[PDB]
């Protein structure tokens, strides 16, 4: 583990505070601008859609990535939520009401047992079965997110190879001739401190770089900084052009 | 069912070239082309054959998974990216012919022919050398026959495992952003006249899929970038991509 404070410039430039963590898979070495914040545990908010998806597929609550989840007809503040979805679009638009229905069908007993098997954060689901990742007792750090994502990348979690390949498909965010990004955003607003997340990895021709970042997010105006500050660090380190 | 749109010919004559683009709208079950005759003419598949060759190698266990390393044989070749170690993902991306020739020798003639019959792949004919028939033997396929094959792959309906189909669709990944995903493969046929370039694949949108297959005359390697550029001009004209 090594601390690079020069990355703080990318936060200062936007009058913002947070952490970026990087893990080089080939060399088995980690890098961060803030070793203490890298190990601070927060609510995961919509980054929980990665384990929630795995559990729903392995139990047969979701049959495949094409199954349609029909809109329930309740008009909500996010326009993209008021329509029919599948697993790929529900991930892409972070569709909370679809994932709340998955959690209710999984139930408390199976949810708790799967999170112990994954070694996920503080393993504590206290609160509503369909909101504990937004305003209950579960907590995870940036370094614990990387540990979990490394198991997913190598198909080492205790669910089928099929469930792991489908979720990695749903995480696809960007691809071109230089790199592929598989990742998930989050925004924790119900309990202080309000924060934004981006967790995932960068696939290159002959290496993989795992990342996890969080930052203070007192309003929704800064949400685009989650991806923009991470890409400034990846360019500085010569990982992407 | 099928409609001819000759306005697309402007994207070929812009570059003093000749060719065909074929599109299929999965939701509406309707096809579109600039040239109904060329859309049904048969050509060597060249490196577009890496899609069925990958499926057969995985289903028979010649390739264990997308991480297995194929070591360079230490024979210096023309293309710098071929003179290094590869896995399935990088071998598809850089079109590494020597890696796929070794897959074909390990599959062998009898198993290769049985699987192309099971896929209904083009004329199903592997006559010629087992390690070069897709470059200079008897096999031929049309743009419309490429779409029929890719539709089966998209729906996991080919006669190989779901696993084999999922890994090959991962190796086909070409471009992704907030508007669309492209899964596809390039080809370049030079050993038999006429010399042609291919691009075959599909575009995934939020609520539809568009399949595509194009080929074009390719008298020199200088025009190879037009395979993708002319296809994307057609996709933009039809408002499929921004």
Burial class (CB in 10 A: 0-12, 13-18, 19+), B183: buried
Nearest to B212 by CA among B150, B168, B130: B150
Residue A173 to chain B, least CA–CA distance (Å): 6
B92 touches B185 (CB < 8 A): yes
Contact residues on chain A for B207, CB-CB shorter than 8 A:
89
Token pair of B2 as six digits: 């099928």
The answer to whether the CB atoms of A174 and B174 lie below 8 A apart is no
DSSP bridge partners of B51: none
Burial class (CB in 10 A: 0-12, 13-18, 19+), A193: exposed
Quote the CA–CA distance of B207 and A115 in Å, as a whole number: 33
To the nearest 5 percent, what fractions of chain B are helix, strand and coil? 40, 20, 40
Q: By the CB < 8 Å criterion, does B174 face chain A?
A: yes
Residue B188 to chain A, least CA–CA distance (Å): 19
Experimental approach: X-ray
The tally of CA atoms less than 13 A away on the side-chain side of residue B124 is 10
- Per the annotation, the verdict on A160 as an active-site residue is no
- Give the residue ranges of DSSP H helices in chain A: 8-12, 35-38, 49-59, 87-92, 96-106, 108-118, 132-135, 142-153, 161-170, 225-236
Q: How many residues does chain A have?
A: 241
Q: By the CB < 8 Å criterion, does A82 face chain B?
A: no
Distance of CA A188 to the CA centre of its chain: 12
Structural domains of chain A sorted by starting position, each given as residue range(s) with its CATH number in brackets: 2-236 (3.40.710.10)
A69 touches A54 (CB < 8 A): no
Quote the CA–CA distance of A230 and B151 in Å, as a whole number: 37
Give, in degrees to the nearest 5, the angle at Cα A53 between A48 and A56: 125
The answer to whether the CB atoms of B162 and A162 lie below 8 A apart is yes
Q: How many residues does chain B have?
A: 242
Nearest to B87 by CA among B63, B60, B108, B104: B63
Contact residues on chain A for B170, CB-CB shorter than 8 A:
165, 169
DSSP bridge partners of A196: A187, A215
Quote the CA–CA distance of B118 and B113 in Å, as a whole number: 9
Q: By the CB < 8 Å criterion, does A63 face chain B?
A: no
A53: number of Cβ within 10 Å:
23
Contact residues on chain A for B174, CB-CB shorter than 8 A:
175
The answer to whether the CB atoms of A89 and B206 lie below 8 A apart is yes
């Amino acid at each position: 583990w090594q601390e690079n404070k020069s990355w703080n410039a990318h936060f200062t430039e936007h009058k913002s505070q947070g952490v970026v963590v990087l893990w080089n898979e080939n060399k088995q070495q980690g890098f961060t601008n803030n070793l203490k914040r890298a190990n601070q545990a927060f609510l995961p908010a919509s980054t929980f859609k990665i384990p929630n998806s795995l559990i729903a597929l392995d139990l047969g609550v979701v049959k495949d990535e094409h199954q349609v989840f029909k809109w329930d007809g309740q008009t909500r503040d996010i326009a993209t939520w008021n329509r029919d979805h599948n697993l790929i679009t529900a991930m892409k638009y972070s569709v909370v009401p679809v994932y709340q229905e998955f959690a209710r069908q999984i139930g408390e007993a199976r949810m708790s047992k799967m999170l112990h098997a994954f070694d996920y954060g503080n393993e504590d689901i206290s609160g509503n079965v369909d909101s504990f990742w937004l305003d209950g007792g579960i907590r995870i750090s940036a370094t614990e997110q990387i540990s979990f994502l490394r198991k997913l990348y190598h198909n080492k979690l205790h669910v089928s190879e099929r469930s792991q390949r489908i979720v990695k498909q749903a995480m696809l965010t960007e691809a071109n001739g230089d790199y592929i990004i598989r990742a998930k955003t989050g925004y924790s607003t119900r309990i202080e401190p309000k924060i934004g997340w981006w967790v995932g990895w960068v696939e290159l021709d002959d290496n993989v770089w795992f990342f996890a970042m969080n930052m203070d997010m007192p309003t929704s105006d800064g949400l685009g900084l989650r991806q923009a500050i991470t890409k400034e660090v990846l360019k500085q380190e010569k990982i992407i052009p």
